[PDB]
Design an enzyme around this catalytic site. Structure first.
Site, PDB file in Angstrom:
ATOM      1  N   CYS A  44       1.164  -0.959   0.246  1.00 51.49           N
ATOM      2  CA  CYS A  44       0.318   0.083   0.217  1.00 51.49           C
ATOM      3  C   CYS A  44       0.691   1.114   0.031  1.00 51.49           C
ATOM      4  O   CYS A  44       1.528   1.329   0.953  1.00 51.49           O
ATOM      5  CB  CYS A  44      -1.092   0.088   0.739  1.00 51.49           C
ATOM      6  SG  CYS A  44      -2.391   1.666   1.737  1.00 51.49           S
ATOM      7  N   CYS A  74      -0.143   4.255   3.085  1.00 52.86           N
ATOM      8  CA  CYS A  74      -0.175   4.470   3.751  1.00 52.86           C
ATOM      9  C   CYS A  74       1.478   4.240   4.137  1.00 52.86           C
ATOM     10  O   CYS A  74       1.328   4.969   5.192  1.00 52.86           O
ATOM     11  CB  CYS A  74      -0.133   2.085   3.964  1.00 52.86           C
ATOM     12  SG  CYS A  74      -1.837   1.196   3.483  1.00 52.86           S
TER      13      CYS A  74
END
Ligand code: ZN
Ligand code: ZN
Lengths: 119, 117
Positions: free
Chosen positions: B41, B44
């Site tokens: 991700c 993130c």
């Protein structure tokens, strides 16, 4: 800092979340009959008046409920109704006892006495 | 005489038979953030340091948890996670507030002061 979470820990720190299958739990204040019937059922028309008089004879001791499977298809489906009538005998505690097909007044009284009223 | 029942009436007079209740019962002693993240991700990467920071300035007021969805596939699947990051704000009472997508430190403080505290 931030706290890493396994599922095992999630169940303790966040929520014990699984939707476990609900155990049977009767909510009425008297034991009951539940009669799953249909308008096109032959026997039911003979049984019908028998249930009315039984509901008077045992008035204050039991309830006698009727479910019209045509008008309540979700309920009927969820309870796997196949035979018409299907009659449930629901005691205050314990699993319902299920009879498929028509019954005589004396057969009904038998179940009411032994199963509903614990004689 | 006999009593006819609708399904709704059955639910009250016979048995509330469906598995449709379960109350969300948060078990923690302070409000929480739960950050569903993954290594793959991108956003993130920006959110991580921000959470660690927030973790400090709100120490003792809230907990900030992190769930690696690839290590906890049952959790991710059971909660129908559909994008990463997904961030939950969990109050002492009430359903959690769920936000899909990365947020800013200014935004996270928003939810914290308003939803959690
Ligand atoms: Zn159902
Ligand atoms: Zn599960």
């Amino acid at each position: 800092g931030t706290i890493h979470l396994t599922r095992a820990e999630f169940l303790k720190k966040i929520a014990d979340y699984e939707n476990h299958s609900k155990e049977w739990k009767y909510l009425g204040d008297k034991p009951a009959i539940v009669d799953f019937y249909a308008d096109w059922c032959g026997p039911c028309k003979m049984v019908a008046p028998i249930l009315e008089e039984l509901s008077k004879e045992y008035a204050g001791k039991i309830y006698i409920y009727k479910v019209n499977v045509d008008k309540e298809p979700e309920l009927a489906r969820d309870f796997g109704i196949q035979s018409i009538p299907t009659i449930w005998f629901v005691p205050m505690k314990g699993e319902p006892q299920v009879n498929m097909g028509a019954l005589s007044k004396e057969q009904l009284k038998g179940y009411i006495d032994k199963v509903l009223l614990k004689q």
